[PDB]
Structure 1
Amino acid sequence: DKTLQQIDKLICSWLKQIDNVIPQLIMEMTDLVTNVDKQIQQQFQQFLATYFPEHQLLAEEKSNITNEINHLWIMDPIDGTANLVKQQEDYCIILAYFYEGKPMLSYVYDYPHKKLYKAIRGEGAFCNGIKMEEPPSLKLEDAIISFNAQVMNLDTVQDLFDASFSYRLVGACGLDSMRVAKGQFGAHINTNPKPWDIAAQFLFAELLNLKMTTLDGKAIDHLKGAPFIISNKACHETVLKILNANGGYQKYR
């Protein structure tokens, strides 16, 4: 079976030939029309058959038996749907490859800004092919944090605002997560991801020495997904502590 060099080589070429499906979808002058891509999912289903006949794909509808597959791809063809629909910007393609359950390749493609982030085990992380280094230490009071504030209880919201440097939000799990990997954000939180919302993220967190865990501090199952944090190492513990304090982060009423 194939080398990561050969797989990545073929993946990068495939992504670069989806500039032939979005311009058209950016149409939407009649969504929903976004649900149907999905074309993207199915076209990548074709790429696997053509190239990697034993590889399987986990994506939004439909899968089915998930453990234990040798060669597994997990995809969000469009992460940041509201952004694509409302903004035509700040959305991305997420792809991740797992071998015997080990993350081997990850991609986050910021198609609107022409930025491909890639993670390769054995080589490192890259953005348009220039090597990403471990971000510098970020304490919570020195960092910008990103989360959905409409979905947490007000007191937990207040406390995050007070303990952080600032708050921002891009609105695509994949992009808010790259801002963490890049040192731009100290942490990103998602209170209800699907496995494809965070699958690429594991290898970047590993290769760039980030913490990526559940909100209870535990290791995440890539096949199932969980309320999740990706964080700079110097502010991981403090964010979790704010989230879990005074009976937790969940919003009621």
Structure 2
Amino acid sequence: KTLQQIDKLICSWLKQIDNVIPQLIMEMTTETKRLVTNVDKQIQQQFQQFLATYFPEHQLLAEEKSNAMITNEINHLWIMDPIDGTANLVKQQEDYCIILAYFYEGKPMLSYVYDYPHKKLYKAIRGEGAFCNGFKMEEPPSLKLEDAIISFNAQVMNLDTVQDLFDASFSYRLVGACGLDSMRVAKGQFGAHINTNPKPWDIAAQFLFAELLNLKMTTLDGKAIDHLKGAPFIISNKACHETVLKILNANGGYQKYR
């Protein structure tokens, strides 16, 4: 099973998914948990079927199923967010994506962020590189924080620290889907993106993008992230990583509550 052969299958499934999604939206149903739609659930279930059929040994860690059965020592693992940006899907029908990442004996090998509304497939392949619709991505120019746009959820952080980030950055922007805000960092459009409480599926693809494009991707302590577990995280241009972490840890830390 070469990486290229697997990649062929995935890109092909993603392409057929264009033909399914307009119908799911047509008949869009929404519900609460404490949002999720038929689109989230169906995309996920079809991917499960795809695996059953092409890669029966492979396991799936995904948002809309239980993941109690997933362990540290698993050979072939897919982590999926079937729709990242559900709020955007529901309210805007735009600015949402599918996230897929393949880990072989725990090492990231393939990653996908499919911006379906703009028909832009970001992909990362170990040994080949990272690509947007087959235009090859390269390491972005250095961005010092003062010269860069940052993205984060300001509703979930201490107001002192939110203000410090505003003062230290060039501007603030928010797409509102972790995958897409993270790709803005990979493309050099944003300096950094922060999500203070992500699940494994919110960040799964980003590990390989960060490695191949020389981005820093760490916890808000600067540590490695366990892809099997969440952690408060940042994906950042290498030139503004330290400054952002310094700000987040200043003033008794970034958490809104102690």
TM-based fold match above 0.5: yes
- Between the two proteins, the alignment pairs up a number of residues equal to 250
Give the whole-Å Cα distance in 1 for the aligned partners of 2:36 and 2:108: 32
* More off after superposition, 142-151 vs 57-66: 57-66
Tell me if the contact between 1:96 and 1:107 (Cα under 8 Å) persists in the aligned partners. yes
5+ long unaligned stretches in structure 2: 29-34
Separation of aligned partners in 1, 2:223 and 2:204: 16
Distance 1:183 1:127 in 2: 13
Return the alpha-carbon distance in structure 2 between the equivalents of residues 86 and 62 of structure 1: 24
> Is the 1:38–1:77 contact (alpha carbons within 8 Å) kept by the matching residues of 2?
yes
Structure-to-structure mapping, 1:228-239, within 5 angstroms: 228-239=233-244
Taking the aligned partners of 1:24 and 1:250, their CA distance within structure 2 comes to 41
CA contact (8 A) 2:79 2:102 kept: yes
Distance in 1 between residues matched to 2:215 and 2:232, nearest whole Å: 17
- Structure 1 residues 41, 135: CA separation in 2 closer, same or farther (over 3 Å shift)? same
Cα shift at 1:37: 2.7
Deviation at 1:193, TM superposition (A): 0.5
**Aligned residues of 1:180 and 1:186 also touching (Cα < 8 A):** yes
2:229 aligned counterpart, secondary structure: coil
Q: Does 1:189 align with 2:194?
A: yes
Maintained 8 Å contact 1:25/1:34: no
Question: Cα distance, 1:63 vs. partner?
Answer: 4.2
| Residue 106 (structure 2) pairs with residue 101 (structure 1) | yes
91-100 or 14-23, which deviates more: 14-23
CA contact (8 A) 1:180 1:188 kept: yes
- Structure 1: which 5+ residue stretches go unaligned? none
| Partner residue of 2:182 out of 177, 180, 197 | 177
Partner of 1:8: 7
Question: Contact 2:148/2:169 (CA < 8 Å) preserved in 1?
Answer: yes
How many Å separate the matches in 2 of 1:186 and 1:33?
A: 30
Question: What secondary structure does 1:57 align onto?
Answer: strand
Secondary structure of the 2:40 match is: coil
* Alpha carbons 2:148, 2:191 under 8 Å: kept: yes
Instruction: Report the secondary structure of 2:180's partner residue.
Output: helix
CA contact (8 A) 2:120 2:133 kept: yes
CA RMSD of aligned residues (A): 1.4
2:21–2:39 contact (8 Å) kept in structure 1: no
Please report how far the alpha carbon of residue 26 of structure 1 lies from its aligned counterpart in structure 2 after TM superposition.
Answer: 2.3
> What's the TM-score, normalizing by structure 1?
0.96
- The alignment-based identity, stated in percent, is 100
8 A Cα contact 1:25 1:33, kept in partner:
no
Report deviation, 1:28: 5.1
List, as ranges, runs of 4+ consecutive aligned residues in structure 1 with deviation greater than 4 Å. Answer: none
Change (3 A) 1:3 1:234: same
Scaled by the length of structure 2, what TM-score is found?
A: 0.94
SS in 2 for 1:37: helix
For residue 37 of structure 1, the aligned residue among 37, 40, 43 is 40
Taking a change above 3 Å as real, the CA distance of residues 52 and 6 of structure 1, as seen in their structure-2 partners, is: same
